[PDB]
């Protein structure tokens, strides 16, 4: 067995959901999933989805104040994992928003989930399609770093990351 591994399909099914948003009301739009960090299965085997570990993007004003922590913070070097981050950021004119797969891979992850992940990079992207953009590092610091997703928005105008950090 070469690629040893097979996505749940409900991979896809959570993915859907950020890349068509799926919002409406004021309600909707704020309970976006702005870091969904999926993880392999049981098995070491199959990529799926995390049901306690997906942050928000209206968690920023509901009770949280930076989510892009929260990531990281629920990212550490020994659980190598996938995430698809929102570049909530605000330039010189208005916010936007980019979808980036932040591929967490900590090189000094465990080999018992991390050879997978690793040669599992591209069995992932065999359903994203090239995903848009993207961010893998493997460190606290790459990962931890706001100037690290502000790499892929526009810093040349962007005054804030999340209206604060930047």
């Given at each position: 067995m070469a690629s040893g591994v097979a996505v749940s399909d409900g991979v896809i099914k959570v993915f859907n959901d950020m890349k068509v948003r799926k919002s409406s009301t004021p309600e909707e739009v704020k309970k976006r999933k702005k870091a969904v960090l999926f993880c392999l299965?049981?098995?070491?085997?199959?990529?799926?989805?995390?049901?306690?570990?997906?942050?928000?993007?209206?968690?920023?004003?509901?009770?949280?104040?930076?989510?892009?922590?929260?990531?990281?913070?629920?990212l550490p070097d020994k659980d190598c994992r996938y995430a698809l981050y929102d570049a909530t950021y605000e330039t010189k004119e208005s916010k936007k928003e980019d979808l980036v797969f932040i591929f967490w891979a900590p090189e000094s992850a465990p080999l018992k989930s991390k050879m997978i992940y690793a040669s599992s990079?591209?069995?992932?992207?065999?359903?994203?399609?090239?995903?848009?953009?993207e961010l893998q590092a493997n460190c606290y610091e790459e990962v931890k770093d706001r100037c690290t997703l502000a790499e892929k928005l526009g810093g040349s105008a962007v005054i804030s990351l999340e209206g604060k950090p930047l």
């Amino acid at each position: 067995m070469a690629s040893g591994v097979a996505v749940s399909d409900g991979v896809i099914k959570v993915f859907n959901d950020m890349k068509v948003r799926k919002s409406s009301t004021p309600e909707e739009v704020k309970k976006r999933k702005k870091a969904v960090l999926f993880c392999l299965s049981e098995d070491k085997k199959n990529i799926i989805l995390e049901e306690g570990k997906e942050i928000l993007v209206g968690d920023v004003g509901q009770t949280v104040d930076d989510p892009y922590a929260t990531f990281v913070k629920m990212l550490p070097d020994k659980d190598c994992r996938y995430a698809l981050y929102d570049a909530t950021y605000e330039t010189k004119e208005s916010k936007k928003e980019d979808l980036v797969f932040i591929f967490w891979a900590p090189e000094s992850a465990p080999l018992k989930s991390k050879m997978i992940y690793a040669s599992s990079k591209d069995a992932i992207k065999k359903k994203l399609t090239g995903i848009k953009h993207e961010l893998q590092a493997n460190c606290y610091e790459e990962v931890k770093d706001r100037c690290t997703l502000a790499e892929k928005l526009g810093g040349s105008a962007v005054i804030s990351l999340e209206g604060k950090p930047l």
